[PDB]
Coordinates of C-alpha atoms and ligand atoms in Angstrom, one line a residue:
Chain A
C1 CA 0.0 0.0 0.0
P2 CA 1.4 3.5 -1.0
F3 CA 1.3 4.8 2.7
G4 CA 4.8 6.2 1.9
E5 CA 3.2 8.7 -0.6
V6 CA 1.2 10.1 2.4
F7 CA 3.6 9.9 5.5
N8 CA 6.9 10.6 3.6
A9 CA 5.2 13.3 1.4
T10 CA 7.5 16.3 0.9
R11 CA 4.5 18.9 0.8
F12 CA 1.5 18.9 3.2
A13 CA -1.9 20.8 3.0
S14 CA -3.1 23.7 5.1
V15 CA -5.6 22.2 7.6
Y16 CA -8.6 24.1 5.9
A17 CA -7.7 22.6 2.5
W18 CA -6.8 19.2 4.1
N19 CA -5.7 16.5 1.5
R20 CA -7.5 13.1 1.1
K21 CA -5.8 10.2 -0.7
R22 CA -7.9 7.1 -1.5
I23 CA -6.2 3.7 -0.8
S24 CA -7.9 0.5 -2.3
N25 CA -6.0 -2.7 -3.4
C26 CA -2.8 -3.6 -1.4
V27 CA -1.6 -4.5 2.3
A28 CA -0.8 -2.3 5.4
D29 CA 2.2 -2.5 7.9
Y30 CA 3.6 -1.2 11.3
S31 CA 5.1 2.2 12.4
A32 CA 9.3 5.9 17.0
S33 CA 9.4 9.2 15.0
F34 CA 5.7 9.9 15.9
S35 CA 4.6 11.9 19.1
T36 CA 0.9 10.8 18.6
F37 CA -0.4 7.3 17.5
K38 CA -4.0 7.1 18.8
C39 CA -6.5 4.6 17.3
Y40 CA -10.4 4.6 17.9
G41 CA -12.7 1.6 17.3
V42 CA -9.7 -0.8 16.6
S43 CA -6.4 -1.6 18.3
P44 CA -2.9 -2.8 17.1
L45 CA -7.8 -7.0 9.8
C46 CA -9.4 -6.1 6.3
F47 CA -11.5 -3.2 5.1
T48 CA -13.4 -2.0 1.9
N49 CA -11.3 1.2 1.4
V50 CA -8.8 3.2 3.5
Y51 CA -8.8 7.1 3.4
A52 CA -5.5 8.9 4.4
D53 CA -6.3 12.5 5.5
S54 CA -3.2 14.7 5.9
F55 CA -2.5 18.4 6.9
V56 CA -0.5 20.8 9.2
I57 CA -1.6 22.4 12.5
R58 CA 0.0 23.7 15.8
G59 CA 1.3 21.1 18.3
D60 CA -1.3 22.2 21.0
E61 CA -4.2 21.6 18.4
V62 CA -3.3 17.9 18.0
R63 CA -5.7 17.1 21.0
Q64 CA -8.6 18.5 18.7
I65 CA -8.2 15.7 16.0
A66 CA -10.3 13.2 18.0
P67 CA -14.0 12.2 18.3
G68 CA -16.2 15.0 19.9
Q69 CA -13.6 17.8 20.4
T70 CA -14.3 21.5 19.9
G71 CA -12.0 24.5 19.1
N72 CA -11.4 26.4 15.8
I73 CA -9.8 23.2 14.2
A74 CA -12.5 20.6 15.1
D75 CA -15.4 23.2 14.5
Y76 CA -14.2 25.0 11.3
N77 CA -11.3 23.0 9.7
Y78 CA -11.3 19.2 10.2
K79 CA -14.1 17.3 12.1
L80 CA -14.0 13.6 13.1
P81 CA -17.4 11.9 13.7
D82 CA -18.3 10.7 17.3
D83 CA -18.5 7.0 16.0
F84 CA -15.0 7.3 14.2
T85 CA -13.1 4.0 13.4
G86 CA -9.5 4.9 12.3
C87 CA -6.0 6.0 13.5
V88 CA -4.7 9.6 14.2
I89 CA -0.9 10.1 13.7
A90 CA 1.1 13.3 14.3
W91 CA 4.8 14.4 14.6
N92 CA 6.8 17.6 15.1
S93 CA 7.6 19.1 11.7
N94 CA 9.6 22.2 12.8
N95 CA 12.5 21.0 10.6
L96 CA 10.4 21.1 7.3
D97 CA 7.6 23.6 8.0
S98 CA 9.1 26.6 10.0
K99 CA 11.1 29.4 8.3
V100 CA 13.5 32.2 9.5
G101 CA 11.0 35.0 8.6
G102 CA 7.9 33.1 9.6
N103 CA 6.2 30.6 7.3
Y104 CA 3.0 32.2 5.9
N105 CA 1.8 29.4 3.7
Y106 CA 0.0 27.2 6.3
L107 CA -3.4 28.8 6.9
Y108 CA -6.5 28.0 9.1
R109 CA -10.2 29.1 9.1
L110 CA -10.9 31.4 12.1
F111 CA -14.6 32.4 11.3
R112 CA -17.5 30.4 9.8
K113 CA -21.4 30.8 10.1
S114 CA -21.7 27.1 11.4
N115 CA -19.6 24.0 12.3
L116 CA -18.4 21.5 9.6
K117 CA -20.1 18.1 9.6
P118 CA -17.6 15.2 10.0
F119 CA -15.1 14.9 7.0
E120 CA -16.5 18.2 5.4
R121 CA -13.9 20.5 3.6
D122 CA -14.4 24.2 3.0
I123 CA -11.9 26.1 0.7
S124 CA -14.0 29.4 0.5
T125 CA -12.2 32.8 0.5
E126 CA -15.5 34.7 0.9
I127 CA -15.6 37.6 3.5
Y128 CA -17.4 36.6 6.8
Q129 CA -20.5 38.8 7.7
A130 CA -20.4 39.3 11.5
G131 CA -22.7 42.4 11.8
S132 CA -26.0 43.5 10.0
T133 CA -24.3 45.2 6.9
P134 CA -23.6 43.0 3.9
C135 CA -19.8 42.9 3.0
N136 CA -18.6 44.3 -0.4
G137 CA -15.5 42.1 -0.3
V138 CA -13.6 44.6 2.1
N139 CA -17.8 44.0 11.0
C140 CA -16.4 42.4 7.7
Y141 CA -13.3 40.0 8.2
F142 CA -11.2 37.6 5.9
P143 CA -12.0 34.1 7.3
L144 CA -8.5 32.5 6.8
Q145 CA -5.4 33.3 8.9
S146 CA -1.7 32.2 8.9
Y147 CA 0.1 30.2 11.6
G148 CA 3.4 32.0 10.7
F149 CA 5.5 29.1 12.0
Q150 CA 9.0 30.1 13.3
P151 CA 11.7 27.6 14.2
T152 CA 12.3 29.3 17.7
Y153 CA 8.6 29.1 19.1
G154 CA 7.7 26.7 21.9
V155 CA 6.7 23.1 21.0
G156 CA 2.9 24.0 21.4
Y157 CA 3.2 26.7 18.6
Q158 CA 5.4 24.5 16.3
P159 CA 4.0 22.9 13.0
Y160 CA 3.0 19.2 13.4
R161 CA 2.1 17.1 10.4
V162 CA -1.0 14.9 10.9
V163 CA -2.2 11.8 9.0
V164 CA -5.8 10.5 9.7
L165 CA -6.6 7.0 8.4
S166 CA -10.3 6.2 8.0
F167 CA -11.4 2.5 7.6
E168 CA -14.9 2.1 5.9
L169 CA -17.1 -1.0 5.6
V170 CA -6.7 -3.6 2.1
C171 CA -5.6 -6.3 4.7
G172 CA -3.2 -6.1 7.7
Chain B
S1 CA 25.4 28.4 15.6
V2 CA 28.6 26.5 14.6
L3 CA 29.6 22.8 14.2
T4 CA 33.3 23.0 15.3
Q5 CA 35.8 20.7 13.6
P6 CA 39.6 20.5 14.1
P7 CA 41.2 22.5 11.3
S8 CA 43.5 19.7 10.2
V9 CA 44.4 16.0 10.9
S10 CA 47.2 13.8 9.3
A11 CA 48.5 10.2 9.4
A12 CA 50.6 7.8 7.2
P13 CA 49.0 5.8 4.4
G14 CA 47.3 2.7 6.1
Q15 CA 46.6 4.5 9.4
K16 CA 43.2 5.6 10.9
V17 CA 42.0 9.2 11.5
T18 CA 38.9 10.5 13.3
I19 CA 37.2 13.9 12.7
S20 CA 35.0 15.3 15.6
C21 CA 32.1 17.6 15.0
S22 CA 30.7 19.3 18.2
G23 CA 27.4 21.3 18.2
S24 CA 24.3 21.8 20.4
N25 CA 20.9 20.3 21.2
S26 CA 19.3 22.3 18.3
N27 CA 21.5 20.6 15.6
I28 CA 23.6 17.4 16.1
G29 CA 21.7 16.5 19.4
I30 CA 18.3 16.1 17.6
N31 CA 19.1 15.7 13.9
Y32 CA 20.8 13.4 11.4
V33 CA 24.5 14.3 10.7
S34 CA 25.9 14.1 7.2
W35 CA 29.6 14.2 6.0
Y36 CA 30.8 15.8 2.7
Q37 CA 34.2 15.1 1.1
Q38 CA 35.7 18.0 -1.0
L39 CA 38.8 16.9 -3.0
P40 CA 41.1 19.8 -4.0
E41 CA 39.4 21.8 -6.9
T42 CA 36.2 19.7 -6.9
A43 CA 32.5 19.9 -5.7
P44 CA 31.7 18.5 -2.3
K45 CA 30.3 14.9 -2.4
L46 CA 28.1 13.1 0.2
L47 CA 30.2 10.6 2.1
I48 CA 27.9 9.8 5.0
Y49 CA 24.1 10.5 5.7
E50 CA 21.7 9.6 8.6
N51 CA 24.7 9.6 11.0
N52 CA 26.3 6.4 9.6
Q53 CA 24.9 5.4 6.2
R54 CA 27.2 5.2 3.1
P55 CA 25.9 6.2 -0.4
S56 CA 26.5 3.5 -3.1
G57 CA 30.2 3.8 -4.1
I58 CA 31.6 5.0 -0.7
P59 CA 33.9 2.3 0.8
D60 CA 33.4 0.9 4.3
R61 CA 36.8 2.4 5.3
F62 CA 34.5 5.5 5.9
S63 CA 32.3 5.2 9.0
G64 CA 30.2 7.7 11.0
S65 CA 28.8 7.9 14.5
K66 CA 26.9 10.4 16.7
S67 CA 26.8 10.6 20.5
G68 CA 25.0 13.5 22.3
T69 CA 25.9 16.8 20.6
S70 CA 29.1 15.4 18.8
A71 CA 29.5 13.3 15.6
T72 CA 32.7 11.5 14.4
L73 CA 34.0 10.5 11.0
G74 CA 36.5 7.6 10.9
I75 CA 38.8 6.8 7.9
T76 CA 40.7 3.5 8.2
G77 CA 43.4 2.4 5.7
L78 CA 44.1 6.0 4.7
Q79 CA 45.0 6.3 1.0
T80 CA 46.4 9.3 -1.1
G81 CA 42.9 9.8 -2.6
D82 CA 41.5 10.5 1.0
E83 CA 43.4 13.9 1.2
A84 CA 40.5 16.3 1.2
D85 CA 38.4 18.8 3.2
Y86 CA 35.7 17.0 5.2
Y87 CA 32.6 18.9 6.5
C88 CA 29.9 17.6 8.8
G89 CA 26.4 19.1 8.5
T90 CA 22.9 18.8 9.9
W91 CA 19.7 20.9 10.1
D92 CA 19.6 23.4 13.1
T93 CA 16.0 23.1 14.3
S94 CA 16.2 26.5 16.1
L95 CA 17.8 28.4 13.2
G96 CA 15.6 26.9 10.4
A97 CA 18.7 26.4 8.3
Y98 CA 21.1 23.7 7.3
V99 CA 24.6 24.2 8.8
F100 CA 28.0 22.9 7.6
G101 CA 31.0 22.3 10.1
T102 CA 34.1 24.6 10.0
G103 CA 35.8 21.8 7.9
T104 CA 38.9 19.6 8.4
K105 CA 41.9 19.2 6.1
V106 CA 43.1 15.6 6.1
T107 CA 46.8 15.2 5.0
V108 CA 48.0 11.7 4.0
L109 CA 51.6 11.9 5.2
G110 CA 54.1 11.1 2.3
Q111 CA 57.1 12.8 4.0
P112 CA 58.2 14.0 7.4
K113 CA 56.4 17.0 8.9
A114 CA 58.4 20.2 8.1
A115 CA 58.3 23.4 10.0
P116 CA 58.0 26.6 8.0
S117 CA 61.1 28.4 6.8
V118 CA 60.3 32.1 7.4
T119 CA 61.9 35.2 5.8
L120 CA 60.8 38.6 7.0
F121 CA 61.8 41.7 4.9
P122 CA 61.4 45.3 6.2
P123 CA 60.0 48.0 4.0
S124 CA 62.6 49.0 1.3
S125 CA 63.9 52.6 1.5
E126 CA 62.4 53.0 -2.0
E127 CA 58.8 52.2 -0.6
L128 CA 59.4 54.5 2.5
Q129 CA 60.3 57.4 0.0
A130 CA 56.9 56.6 -1.8
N131 CA 55.3 57.2 1.7
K132 CA 54.3 53.5 2.1
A133 CA 55.6 50.6 4.4
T134 CA 55.0 46.8 3.7
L135 CA 56.5 44.1 5.9
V136 CA 56.8 40.9 3.8
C137 CA 56.6 37.6 5.7
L138 CA 57.6 34.8 3.3
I139 CA 56.8 31.3 4.5
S140 CA 58.0 28.1 2.7
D141 CA 58.7 24.4 2.9
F142 CA 56.1 23.5 5.6
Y143 CA 54.2 20.2 5.6
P144 CA 51.4 19.6 6.3
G145 CA 50.0 22.7 4.5
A146 CA 48.2 24.6 7.3
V147 CA 49.7 27.7 9.2
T148 CA 48.3 30.6 11.3
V149 CA 50.2 34.0 11.1
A150 CA 50.2 36.6 13.9
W151 CA 52.1 39.9 13.8
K152 CA 53.4 41.9 16.9
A153 CA 54.6 45.5 17.1
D154 CA 57.1 45.4 20.0
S155 CA 55.1 42.7 22.0
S156 CA 51.5 43.8 21.2
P157 CA 49.2 42.0 18.7
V158 CA 48.5 43.8 15.4
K159 CA 45.1 43.0 13.7
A160 CA 44.9 46.0 11.2
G161 CA 46.8 46.0 7.8
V162 CA 47.4 42.2 7.7
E163 CA 46.7 40.3 4.4
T164 CA 47.7 36.6 4.5
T165 CA 47.5 34.1 1.5
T166 CA 46.1 30.5 1.7
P167 CA 48.8 27.9 1.6
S168 CA 49.7 26.6 -1.8
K169 CA 51.5 23.3 -2.8
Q170 CA 55.1 23.8 -4.1
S171 CA 56.7 21.5 -6.7
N172 CA 58.5 19.6 -3.8
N173 CA 55.1 18.8 -2.2
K174 CA 55.7 21.2 0.8
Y175 CA 53.6 24.4 1.0
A176 CA 54.2 28.2 0.6
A177 CA 52.2 31.2 1.9
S178 CA 52.9 34.8 2.6
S179 CA 51.7 37.5 5.0
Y180 CA 51.9 41.3 4.3
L181 CA 51.6 44.0 7.0
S182 CA 50.8 47.5 5.6
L183 CA 51.9 50.4 7.9
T184 CA 52.6 54.2 7.6
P185 CA 56.3 55.0 7.6
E186 CA 55.5 56.8 10.9
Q187 CA 54.1 53.6 12.5
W188 CA 57.1 51.6 11.2
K189 CA 59.7 54.0 12.8
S190 CA 57.7 54.5 16.1
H191 CA 58.3 50.9 17.2
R192 CA 61.6 49.1 18.2
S193 CA 60.6 45.9 16.3
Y194 CA 57.9 44.1 14.4
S195 CA 57.5 40.2 14.4
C196 CA 55.9 37.7 12.1
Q197 CA 54.9 34.6 14.1
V198 CA 54.0 31.5 12.0
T199 CA 52.3 28.6 13.9
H200 CA 52.4 25.1 12.4
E201 CA 51.5 21.8 14.2
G202 CA 51.4 23.7 17.6
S203 CA 55.0 25.0 17.1
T204 CA 55.9 28.6 16.2
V205 CA 58.7 30.2 14.1
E206 CA 59.1 34.0 14.7
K207 CA 61.3 36.4 12.7
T208 CA 61.9 40.0 13.9
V209 CA 62.9 43.2 12.0
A210 CA 63.8 46.7 13.5
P211 CA 63.8 50.2 11.9
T212 CA 67.5 50.1 13.0
Chain C
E1 CA 22.0 9.3 -13.0
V2 CA 21.2 12.5 -11.1
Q3 CA 23.1 15.4 -12.8
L4 CA 23.2 19.1 -11.7
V5 CA 24.7 21.3 -14.5
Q6 CA 25.5 24.9 -13.4
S7 CA 25.9 28.1 -15.6
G8 CA 29.5 29.1 -16.7
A9 CA 32.1 31.3 -14.8
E10 CA 30.9 34.9 -14.2
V11 CA 33.2 38.1 -14.2
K12 CA 31.3 41.2 -12.9
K13 CA 31.8 44.6 -11.3
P14 CA 30.3 45.8 -8.0
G15 CA 26.7 47.1 -8.5
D16 CA 26.0 44.6 -11.4
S17 CA 22.9 42.4 -11.2
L18 CA 23.6 38.6 -11.7
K19 CA 21.4 35.5 -12.0
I20 CA 23.2 32.1 -12.0
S21 CA 21.6 28.9 -13.2
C22 CA 21.5 25.1 -12.2
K23 CA 19.6 22.5 -14.4
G24 CA 18.6 19.2 -12.8
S25 CA 18.3 16.0 -15.0
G26 CA 18.0 12.3 -14.1
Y27 CA 15.2 12.8 -11.6
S28 CA 11.7 14.6 -11.3
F29 CA 13.1 18.2 -10.8
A30 CA 9.6 19.4 -9.5
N31 CA 9.5 16.9 -6.5
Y32 CA 12.8 17.9 -4.7
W33 CA 14.0 20.9 -2.8
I34 CA 17.2 22.4 -4.4
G35 CA 19.5 25.1 -3.0
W36 CA 22.7 27.1 -3.0
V37 CA 26.0 26.9 -0.9
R38 CA 28.8 29.5 -1.0
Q39 CA 32.5 28.9 -0.7
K40 CA 34.9 31.9 -0.7
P41 CA 38.4 31.2 -2.0
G42 CA 40.0 28.9 0.7
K43 CA 37.0 29.0 3.1
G44 CA 34.3 26.7 4.6
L45 CA 30.9 25.8 3.0
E46 CA 28.1 28.4 3.8
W47 CA 24.5 27.2 3.3
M48 CA 22.5 30.0 1.7
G49 CA 19.0 28.5 1.2
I50 CA 16.7 26.2 -0.8
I51 CA 13.5 26.3 -2.9
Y52 CA 10.7 23.8 -3.7
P53 CA 10.3 23.9 -7.5
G54 CA 6.5 23.1 -7.3
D55 CA 5.3 26.3 -5.6
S56 CA 8.6 28.4 -5.0
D57 CA 8.4 28.0 -1.2
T58 CA 11.8 29.0 0.3
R59 CA 14.1 28.6 3.3
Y60 CA 17.0 31.1 3.8
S61 CA 19.7 31.2 6.4
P62 CA 19.8 34.3 8.7
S63 CA 22.8 35.8 6.7
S64 CA 21.3 35.2 3.3
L65 CA 17.6 36.5 3.8
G66 CA 17.1 39.7 1.8
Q67 CA 20.8 39.7 0.5
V68 CA 20.1 37.2 -2.3
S69 CA 17.0 35.7 -4.0
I70 CA 16.4 32.0 -5.2
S71 CA 13.9 31.2 -8.0
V72 CA 12.8 28.3 -10.3
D73 CA 11.6 27.5 -13.9
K74 CA 10.0 24.1 -13.3
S75 CA 9.4 23.7 -17.1
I76 CA 13.2 23.7 -18.0
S77 CA 14.1 21.9 -14.7
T78 CA 16.3 25.0 -13.7
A79 CA 17.0 26.7 -10.3
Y80 CA 18.4 30.2 -10.1
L81 CA 20.3 32.4 -7.6
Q82 CA 20.0 36.2 -8.1
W83 CA 21.6 39.4 -6.8
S84 CA 20.3 42.9 -7.8
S85 CA 23.6 44.6 -6.7
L86 CA 26.8 42.4 -6.3
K87 CA 29.5 43.4 -3.7
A88 CA 33.2 42.3 -4.1
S89 CA 32.5 40.2 -0.9
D90 CA 30.1 38.0 -3.1
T91 CA 33.3 36.6 -4.9
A92 CA 33.0 32.8 -4.3
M93 CA 32.3 29.4 -5.7
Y94 CA 28.5 28.8 -5.6
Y95 CA 27.3 25.1 -5.6
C96 CA 23.6 24.1 -6.2
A97 CA 22.8 21.0 -4.1
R98 CA 19.6 18.8 -4.2
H99 CA 17.9 18.5 -0.7
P100 CA 16.0 15.3 -0.5
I101 CA 14.1 14.8 2.8
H102 CA 16.0 12.2 4.8
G103 CA 14.7 10.5 8.0
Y104 CA 11.0 9.9 8.8
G105 CA 8.4 11.9 10.9
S106 CA 10.1 14.0 13.6
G107 CA 13.6 13.0 12.2
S108 CA 12.7 14.4 8.7
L109 CA 15.2 17.1 7.6
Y110 CA 16.2 18.8 4.3
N111 CA 19.6 17.2 3.4
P112 CA 22.1 18.0 0.6
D113 CA 22.9 14.8 -1.5
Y114 CA 24.0 15.6 -5.1
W115 CA 26.0 18.8 -5.9
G116 CA 26.6 20.6 -9.2
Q117 CA 30.2 21.3 -10.5
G118 CA 30.1 24.9 -9.1
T119 CA 29.9 28.4 -10.6
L120 CA 32.8 30.9 -10.0
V121 CA 31.6 34.4 -9.5
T122 CA 34.4 37.0 -9.6
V123 CA 33.4 40.6 -8.6
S124 CA 36.2 43.2 -8.9
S125 CA 36.1 47.1 -9.4
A126 CA 39.8 47.0 -10.5
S127 CA 41.2 47.6 -14.0
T128 CA 44.5 46.7 -15.8
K129 CA 47.4 48.1 -13.7
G130 CA 51.0 47.1 -14.1
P131 CA 53.0 46.5 -10.9
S132 CA 55.3 48.8 -8.8
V133 CA 58.5 46.7 -8.1
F134 CA 60.5 47.3 -4.9
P135 CA 63.8 45.6 -4.0
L136 CA 64.0 43.4 -0.9
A137 CA 67.7 44.1 -0.1
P138 CA 69.8 41.3 1.5
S139 CA 71.7 41.9 4.9
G140 CA 76.9 31.7 4.2
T141 CA 73.8 32.3 2.0
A142 CA 71.7 35.6 1.8
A143 CA 68.0 36.0 0.9
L144 CA 67.1 38.8 -1.5
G145 CA 63.9 39.6 -3.4
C146 CA 61.3 41.7 -5.3
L147 CA 58.0 42.9 -3.9
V148 CA 55.6 43.2 -6.9
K149 CA 52.9 45.7 -5.6
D150 CA 49.4 46.7 -6.8
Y151 CA 48.8 44.9 -10.1
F152 CA 45.7 43.6 -12.0
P153 CA 44.7 41.2 -13.2
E154 CA 46.7 37.9 -12.7
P155 CA 49.1 36.7 -13.6
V156 CA 52.7 38.0 -13.1
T157 CA 55.8 35.8 -13.7
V158 CA 59.2 36.4 -12.2
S159 CA 62.6 35.2 -13.4
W160 CA 66.1 36.3 -12.0
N161 CA 69.1 37.4 -14.1
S162 CA 67.0 36.7 -17.3
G163 CA 66.9 32.9 -16.4
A164 CA 70.6 32.6 -15.7
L165 CA 69.5 32.1 -12.0
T166 CA 66.9 29.3 -11.3
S167 CA 68.3 27.5 -8.1
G168 CA 67.2 29.1 -4.8
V169 CA 64.3 30.9 -6.7
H170 CA 60.9 30.9 -4.9
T171 CA 58.2 33.1 -6.4
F172 CA 55.1 33.2 -4.1
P173 CA 51.4 33.2 -5.1
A174 CA 49.8 36.7 -4.9
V175 CA 47.7 38.1 -2.1
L176 CA 44.4 39.9 -3.2
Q177 CA 44.4 43.2 -1.1
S178 CA 41.1 45.0 -0.1
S179 CA 41.7 47.5 -2.9
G180 CA 41.1 44.6 -5.5
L181 CA 44.8 44.8 -6.5
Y182 CA 47.3 41.9 -6.2
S183 CA 50.9 41.8 -4.7
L184 CA 53.4 39.0 -4.7
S185 CA 57.1 38.4 -3.7
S186 CA 59.9 36.5 -5.4
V187 CA 63.1 35.6 -3.3
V188 CA 66.4 34.1 -4.3
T189 CA 69.0 32.6 -1.9
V190 CA 72.6 33.2 -3.1
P191 CA 76.2 33.0 -1.6
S192 CA 76.8 36.0 0.8
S193 CA 80.4 36.3 -0.9
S194 CA 78.7 37.0 -4.3
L195 CA 76.9 40.2 -3.0
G196 CA 80.0 42.5 -3.8
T197 CA 80.6 40.9 -7.3
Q198 CA 77.3 39.7 -8.9
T199 CA 74.4 41.9 -10.1
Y200 CA 70.9 40.5 -9.2
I201 CA 67.9 41.6 -11.3
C202 CA 64.4 40.2 -11.0
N203 CA 62.5 40.2 -14.3
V204 CA 58.8 40.9 -13.6
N205 CA 56.5 40.1 -16.5
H206 CA 52.8 41.4 -16.5
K207 CA 51.7 40.4 -20.0
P208 CA 48.2 42.0 -19.4
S209 CA 49.6 45.6 -19.1
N210 CA 52.3 44.7 -21.7
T211 CA 54.8 45.7 -18.9
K212 CA 58.1 44.0 -18.1
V213 CA 60.2 45.6 -15.1
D214 CA 63.8 44.4 -14.6
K215 CA 64.6 45.7 -11.0
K216 CA 68.2 45.7 -9.8
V217 CA 68.4 44.5 -6.1
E218 CA 71.5 45.9 -4.3
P219 CA 72.8 45.2 -0.8
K220 CA 71.8 48.0 1.7
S221 CA 74.6 50.2 3.3
Ligands
NAG1 C1 10.0 6.6 4.8 O1 11.3 6.5 4.3 C2 12.3 5.4 4.7 C3 13.1 4.9 3.5 O2 14.1 5.8 2.9 C4 11.7 4.2 5.5 O3 12.6 3.8 6.6 C5 10.3 4.5 6.1 O4 9.7 3.3 6.5 C6 9.4 5.2 5.0 N1 8.0 5.3 5.6 C7 6.9 4.8 5.0 C8 5.6 4.9 5.8 O5 6.8 4.5 3.8

């Protein structure tokens, strides 16, 4: 199975534009360079398909990639269902994802009129209407912001790379 | 943030040498160390990666290890072809930059170590009459080919006005270099002596010249 | 085989703009970080920064941010390093190096593997100037010489007594001063007894100024 194409991928998505790679016909394997390896519904089997979801967030937002969490990531960027069967894997990526002047390129959604439903993706760049006045693309705010990752920030504010495997109903 | 290496190591063909590389917890402590070989007048080449892995074509005479915040390169069965600059490197997590070590010159000893022969010329009367003053420190016949040069006025260090060449191989396989101190005629006459001090293999040869 | 072919040697004056090139073949150019390392004549390797060809994302060292600019043309598999105003202090060999990701998860780092042949960038504000030649007076062998001051460009050659004198002759490689001009010395070791009797003349040839100077070197009184 081409799990290598997902874990060892040179470029990762912004969490708001999280990347999904469909895995179909092949076999899985085993995985000390990961700070988080948490499975839900199974434990370290065969399945119809495997989905590999991958993106970058802050270290202290990794708690939010789990069933029934809240926060700007779980609510407005990447939502897991309460009944989720799959594994959540993260690791510190300060070496690849932080830059001297601040890395702008990794963005998150800060504002949204309601919560995402589980596994929903929203790539919208449309101005968020907070107040009564409709917004002429200028109480009118841009909904995406940058993490600006810097190599010197504390572990909590460093970029972590996350891979979510979903198993729907490939053999281990 | 610097990865410090010894400037130079030497041994006989067939002997072993080790090259240390000391850093901090942001670089060698956390991250994979690589070594690069640079033969005279060539591009660097990867010699070791992931602390101790050899690319295809790199002989097992070359070995790497890392312990704490220091890495080591070993070369067994030293051969003529091993004579090169070697640089460690790694990613510095805190800097968000790759860093190369200060570099080590390996000399494969084909003759006895030779201390520099040093000749120190005062400014010519011709140059003093042109309102200039150059002390010329001519350094020859040293092996291996690394020196450091320090200048003294009386017994005080002099940093300003010093230009020193890189060592260069002579036809006899020893090395030449030169060091030039630029003064005003006034500075030259106002001191009892100037000294050129050439350090080689921890030993120093000093020549002195005096306005009279 | 992976190949990194760099642009040809560059001769420029301070204040000139300069873009050097490195073309990657033998691999998918687009999928690999690539970057630049600087080596000043006789100095250590200095990492400058890297670029991801796919989307021109960049990583600079402290020293190199704002000074220099790295760019890509993914369609001709070519990486570029660019100055808008060169200083003399930019004189160096510049190597491009591919930076595969080594390691796995938290151990993942950008890591130089393959290097190009290098691109020599020579930045000087100096023009053709013949040397001023000063005698290095001697005083059972005596050392005497010639100081060859303030010339451009390289090279100078030195002989003694029009080639009649080759033993004891050591002509030293030139220093490059801050001015951009060169100086070098030639010394000959001769019997002290000869100093009364034999004339010693160093023949300094600087073909690029069409200048030959034959300087008599006398013992000092
Ligand atoms: C990532 O790369 C290395 C091979 O160079 C290997 O040790 C590791 O298992 C790879 N991981 C995956 C998940 O394919």
